[PDB]
Amino acid sequence: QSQFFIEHILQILPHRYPMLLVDRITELQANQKIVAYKNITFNEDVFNGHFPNKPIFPGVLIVEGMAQSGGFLAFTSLWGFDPEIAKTKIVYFMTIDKVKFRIPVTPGDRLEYHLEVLKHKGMIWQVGGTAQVDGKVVAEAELKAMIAERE
Amino acid sequence: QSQFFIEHILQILPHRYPMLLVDRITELQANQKIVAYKNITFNEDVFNGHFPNKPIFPGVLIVEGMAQSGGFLAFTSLWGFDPEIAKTKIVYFMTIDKVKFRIPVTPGDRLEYHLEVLKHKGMIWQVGGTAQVDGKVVAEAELKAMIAER
Amino acid sequence: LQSQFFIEHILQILPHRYPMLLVDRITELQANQKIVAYKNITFNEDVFNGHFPNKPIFPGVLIVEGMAQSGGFLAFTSLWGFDPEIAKTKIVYFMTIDKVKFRIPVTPGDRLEYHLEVLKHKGMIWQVGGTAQVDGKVVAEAELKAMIAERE
Amino acid sequence: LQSQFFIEHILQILPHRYPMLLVDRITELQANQKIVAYKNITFNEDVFNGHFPNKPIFPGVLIVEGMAQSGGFLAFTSLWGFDPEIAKTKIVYFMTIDKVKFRIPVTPGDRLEYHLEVLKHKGMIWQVGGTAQVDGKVVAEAELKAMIAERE
Amino acid sequence: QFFIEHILQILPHRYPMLLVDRITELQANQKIVAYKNITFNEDVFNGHFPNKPIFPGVLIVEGMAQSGGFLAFTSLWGFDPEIAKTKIVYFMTIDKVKFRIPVTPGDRLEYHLEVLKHKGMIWQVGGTAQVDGKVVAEAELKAMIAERE
Amino acid sequence: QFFIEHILQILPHRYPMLLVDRITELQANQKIVAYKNITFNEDVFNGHFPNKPIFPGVLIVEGMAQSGGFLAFTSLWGFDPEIAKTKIVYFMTIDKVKFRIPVTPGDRLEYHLEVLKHKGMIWQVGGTAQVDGKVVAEAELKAMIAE
Ligand SMILES: O=c1c(O)c(-c2ccc(O)c(O)c2)oc2cc(O)cc(O)c12
Ligand SMILES: O=c1c(O)c(-c2ccc(O)c(O)c2)oc2cc(O)cc(O)c12
Ligand SMILES: [Cl-]
Ligand SMILES: [Cl-]
Ligand SMILES: [Cl-]
Ligand SMILES: [Cl-]
Ligand SMILES: [Cl-]
Numbered sequence: 001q002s003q004f005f006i007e008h009i010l011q012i013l014p015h016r017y018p019m020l021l022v023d024r025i026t027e028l029q030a031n032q033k034i035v036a037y038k039n040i041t042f043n044e045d046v047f048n049g050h051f052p053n054k055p056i057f058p059g060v061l062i063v064e065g066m067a068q069s070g071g072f073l074a075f076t077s078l079w080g081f082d083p084e085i086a087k088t089k090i091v092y093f094m095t096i097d098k099v100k101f102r103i104p105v106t107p108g109d110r111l112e113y114h115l116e117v118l119k120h121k122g123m124i125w126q127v128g129g130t131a132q133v134d135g136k137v138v139a140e141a142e143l144k145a146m147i148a149e150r151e
Numbered sequence: 152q153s154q155f156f157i158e159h160i161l162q163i164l165p166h167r168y169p170m171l172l173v174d175r176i177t178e179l180q181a182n183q184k185i186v187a188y189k190n191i192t193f194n195e196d197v198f199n200g201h202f203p204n205k206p207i208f209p210g211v212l213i214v215e216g217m218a219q220s221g222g223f224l225a226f227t228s229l230w231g232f233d234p235e236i237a238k239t240k241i242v243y244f245m246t247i248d249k250v251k252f253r254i255p256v257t258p259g260d261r262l263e264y265h266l267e268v269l270k271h272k273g274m275i276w277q278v279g280g281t282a283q284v285d286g287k288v289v290a291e292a293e294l295k296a297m298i299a300e301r
Numbered sequence: 302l303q304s305q306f307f308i309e310h311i312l313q314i315l316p317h318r319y320p321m322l323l324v325d326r327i328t329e330l331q332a333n334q335k336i337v338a339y340k341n342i343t344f345n346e347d348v349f350n351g352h353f354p355n356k357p358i359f360p361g362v363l364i365v366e367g368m369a370q371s372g373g374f375l376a377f378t379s380l381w382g383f384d385p386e387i388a389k390t391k392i393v394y395f396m397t398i399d400k401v402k403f404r405i406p407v408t409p410g411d412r413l414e415y416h417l418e419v420l421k422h423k424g425m426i427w428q429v430g431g432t433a434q435v436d437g438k439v440v441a442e443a444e445l446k447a448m449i450a451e452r453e
Numbered sequence: 454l455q456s457q458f459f460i461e462h463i464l465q466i467l468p469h470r471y472p473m474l475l476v477d478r479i480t481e482l483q484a485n486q487k488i489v490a491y492k493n494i495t496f497n498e499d500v501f502n503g504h505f506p507n508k509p510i511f512p513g514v515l516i517v518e519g520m521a522q523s524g525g526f527l528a529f530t531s532l533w534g535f536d537p538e539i540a541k542t543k544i545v546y547f548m549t550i551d552k553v554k555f556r557i558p559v560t561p562g563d564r565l566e567y568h569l570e571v572l573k574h575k576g577m578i579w580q581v582g583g584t585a586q587v588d589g590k591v592v593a594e595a596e597l598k599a600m601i602a603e604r605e
Numbered sequence: 606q607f608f609i610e611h612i613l614q615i616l617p618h619r620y621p622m623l624l625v626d627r628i629t630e631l632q633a634n635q636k637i638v639a640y641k642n643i644t645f646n647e648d649v650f651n652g653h654f655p656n657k658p659i660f661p662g663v664l665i666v667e668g669m670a671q672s673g674g675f676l677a678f679t680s681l682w683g684f685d686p687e688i689a690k691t692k693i694v695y696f697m698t699i700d701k702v703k704f705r706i707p708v709t710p711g712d713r714l715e716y717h718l719e720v721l722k723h724k725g726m727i728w729q730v731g732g733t734a735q736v737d738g739k740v741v742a743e744a745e746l747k748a749m750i751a752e753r754e
Numbered sequence: 755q756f757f758i759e760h761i762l763q764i765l766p767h768r769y770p771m772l773l774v775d776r777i778t779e780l781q782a783n784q785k786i787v788a789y790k791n792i793t794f795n796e797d798v799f800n801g802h803f804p805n806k807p808i809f810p811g812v813l814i815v816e817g818m819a820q821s822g823g824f825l826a827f828t829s830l831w832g833f834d835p836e837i838a839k840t841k842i843v844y845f846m847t848i849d850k851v852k853f854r855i856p857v858t859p860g861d862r863l864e865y866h867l868e869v870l871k872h873k874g875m876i877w878q879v880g881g882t883a884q885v886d887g888k889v890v891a892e893a894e895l896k897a898m899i900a901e
């Protein structure tokens with residue numbers, strides 16, 4: 001498939017509350033690209049601390065959401081849509097590079113992740129791309145993550 | 152103003168985390184109507200329990216977000232954008248009627264509140280309308296509130 | 302089928318969890334007819350952080366929710382008795398809410414008593430109406446229709 | 454000096470806030486002698502996520518903490534009456550806890566009643582003792598010595 | 606030495622009431638040395654207190670209890686997740702509690718408990734909580750180990 | 755040393771996004787050594803991951819940025835809570851980050867940051883995060899202080 005909803009995400013990604021930062025996948029090309037998004041609302045606990053009277057979605061959490069998008073792409077490219085294989089996998093950050101934040105992200109924003117596979121070798125996936133709001137680039141990132149069997 | 156952001160909503164409504172359920176106001180016509188919305192994301196605490204493995208935005212919180220939008224409309228109709236007067240006012244919701252839920256609301260939805268003034272007599276404000284996702288009606292409700300002093 | 306049920310039993314019947322399980326105990330239950338339950342109100346609830354600062358008021362919409370959950374417990378047990386194995390495959394959906402009145406604010410230290418009677422029921426669809434009470438006084442009234450559905 | 458206090462008044466005297474304000478209402482207060490207060494216990498508390506999964510039990514040490522807070526309220530108001538301005542400059546710090554006994558588990562749906570009495574007081578040092586009760590049954594006992602300290 | 610993953614398999618306590626992060630020492634029937642890290646990033650500090658974070662004294666005691674229970678359990682049955690699920694460690698009494706120094710974010714809260722006495726399933730433990738070599742609290746505790754249902 | 759009370763007077767971050775507990779070394783316009791304790795009793799571990807607590811790599815980086823922020827604030831205006839209270843901090847860039855060892859409950863997460871470059875409100879720092887003398891992460895970042 002090309003479109004996946006929160007139920008599908010919960011079945012593939014190991015991340016849970018308050019660290020599951022992808023809400024919906026709009027397009028997916030195996031081994032190539034993913035487009036997904038997270039809705040940004042005031043009703044998130046991060047906003048209590050970042051910052052009082054000035055809610056700004058943390059830049060590092062944008063990068064995290066981009067990584068989880070790459071991780072969803074990584075897993076399904078490897079095993080397809082298989083929750084039973086998925087439930088015992090974990091995802092580790094290995095590197096982060098060339099990230100630039102251009103526009104602050106705030107409550108009411110639809111934070112759209114666009115990742116493209118730059119290089120992959122087995123469990124090691126290197127993706128790069130942008131986060132977008134209303135068609136504009138708010139962030140750029142390059143990252144490398146590893147899929148690993150939980151032990 | 153016509154469009155109000157979270158910064159402005161925080162200065163008018165007393166509601167705070169985890170009970171502020173309006174993120175942005177896109178349309179406002181004094182004494183007539185409001186269009187506002189709240190983004191729905193999995194990263195909300197309510198989804199821990201409603202329900203495990205099946206995230207569905209509570210219907211009662213849709214109604215609550217509709218009430219908050221009605222309240223913002225009422226207050227701004229009376230005083231406009233006035234944070235100082237906002238601190239001295241309470242909007243007490245007295246009744247809720249004719250509410251119907253047609254489509255469930257889930258993480259990834261942009262929950263749009265459409266409310267209009269149905270009746271305004273003195274301190275009493277009667278408002279009603281719909282919640283919409285992607286142009287479709289997901290809920291409807293009528294609500295009555297009283298303006299009072301804090 | 303007993304008349305009194307405690308949190309451990311409610312937990313095995315209702316699909317609701319923290320922070321949306323708003324019934325603590327069932328005191329009276331009549332299959333297909335009526336239920337009396339309650340939820341204790343304490344300052345130590347996260348909801349009071351934003352409703353409101355320096356003025357804790359239990360949200361009216363959450364009173365309606367608690368009445369629905371009471372109704373749902375009546376619905377499940379009426380249909381299947383105390384059966385955690387069947388209950389576990391189900392969720393509850395709100396269909397309608399009507400005739401709600403908020404008469405008295407609910408605050409920390411209140412014992413929120415839910416009184417619901419069955420107005421109509423057929424299969425999975427249940428219509429209930431009643432009041433929320435604190436120290437024998439009506440704090441709110443509501444009518445609502447809910448449906449029990451497979452979680453698929 | 455009143456004998457009944459609600460959450461609004463407790464907030465003005467105690468510095469404790471969420472998730473560590475564990476007294477909801479004061480029912481009796483006699484200066485220098487005693488206090489009867491309570492906290493409602495509900496499933497809708499974060500503490501129950503971890504204590505314990507599938508079996509909600511109110512932590513015994515939190516019962517003690519609530520007894521201490523009731524004791525601290527009694528101590529302060531005995532000396533200054535209901536004085537929010539001065540309360541804001543003072544803090545009750547507990548030095549010792551003794552003879553704690555847990556008799557009955559406290560669960561969601563319980564009204565946890567604190568009964569504290571003054572065993573000894575001289576100036577800022579207050580020694581109190583008593584019980585936590587549910588339905589007139591002693592669920593815990595404790596003795597503690599407190600210190601009315603400067604906040605700065 | 607036991608790490609968080611081991612602790613989680615023995616104790617039924619979960620967030621926000623698991624208050625032991627690591628066990629550095631354990632001598633069966635004798636003593637335990639364990640610790641909990643204190644960080645500002647804990648929900649307790651929102652209310653205890655605003656503008657002045659202080660780790661609650663009762664939670665220091667809870668951490669000592671949890672340490673004492675871990676000692677008593679592993680003394681009898683060792684590292685056994687299967688049996689752990691069949692047992693309950695409930696605390697009957699606490700006594701001789703003294704708070705000496707306030708515990709704040711940045712502290713490594715170290716629990717030192719010894720077995721004072723035990724007979725059957727009743728275990729009396731006691732000791733101190735320590736930060737950087739100083740006693741911040743002390744307590745005696747009595748537990749009963751029972752069958753879980 | 756600067757304690758949490760002092761950290762709160764300078765940094766605008768609050769719970770659950772204040773990820774520095776203590777400042778052990780400060781040298782204006784040069785370097786900072788700080789740390790955060792890692793405990794199981796943090797909300798993030800509920801989702802990262804269930805049954806396997808691992809402190810998020812991105813939050814290691816955030817903790818380093820906040821450490822570098824504290825260095826920036828004080829190098830600019832000294833210990834001045836009055837000025838600090840009007841400001842917030844924006845991430846501008848992140849580069850050359852590598853994670854070596856997972857960070858778990860029980861770890862003392864120590865941040866070492868030196869200034870690479872600064873001009874006005876814009877500060878570029880870089881360094882490492884360490885647990886028990888071992889480098890668990892490297893990073894470079896640029897932040898902006900704003901009214
Ligand atoms: O919706 C509102 C609301 O509920 C309350 C409120 C405040 C205190 C109470 O005790 C109470 O019952 C209600 O105040 C408001 C004030 C506004 O300026 C706008 C609102 O929309 C509300
Ligand atoms: O840990 C537990 C515990 O402390 C108590 C408890 C609490 C207060 C008391 O006064 C008491 O006698 C027992 O019950 C339990 C019941 C279980 O099924 C499992 C437990 O782990 C506990
Ligand atoms: Cl940021
Ligand atoms: Cl619903
Ligand atoms: Cl309300
Ligand atoms: Cl306990
Ligand atoms: Cl304390």
Ligand SMILES: [Cl-]
Pocket residue numbers: 091092093809810811812
């Ligand atoms: Cl990571």
